[PDB]
Symmetry: C2
Amino acid sequence: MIEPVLENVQPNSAASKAGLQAGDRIVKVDGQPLTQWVTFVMLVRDNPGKSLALEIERQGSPLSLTLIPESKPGNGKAIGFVGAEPKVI
Amino acid sequence: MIEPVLENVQPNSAASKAGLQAGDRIVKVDGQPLTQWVTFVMLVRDNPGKSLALEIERQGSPLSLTLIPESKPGNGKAIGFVGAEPKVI
């Protein structure tokens, strides 16, 4: 139900470094289409330090960006984080 | 599908101030039961600067905490943020 559309981008995060912005919609990761935030988050979690090739939509137009999921300060889990919050209905 | 269980808590956020920790499960907000992260996030979004009464579960035991959703630096939308990321399957 949560839409793959960014509400907020955190500073010095994978998302800011990738050039993501509030309002951006995640459309494809590594060529694979997605429609749910959880799909995107699962991929991010599973891929710390791996380049994900993103196709996003901004203002109805496509952009190709690279996102590399990172750890978070204070978190020692072997997972990647986005650095952004999603929009909710 | 995303579980109302925290994977990470951000510093100087509503969640850290509330005393929330990774692994905590959100069980009730203002007496109302929830089972999905989106339900919790909707409430947070809708309630900037309003005290939400949280019942959480940590290690299988209930705790009562207060959470006051806040804005994020650089975001001028009239909404509240949690200050945390959820666990995903």
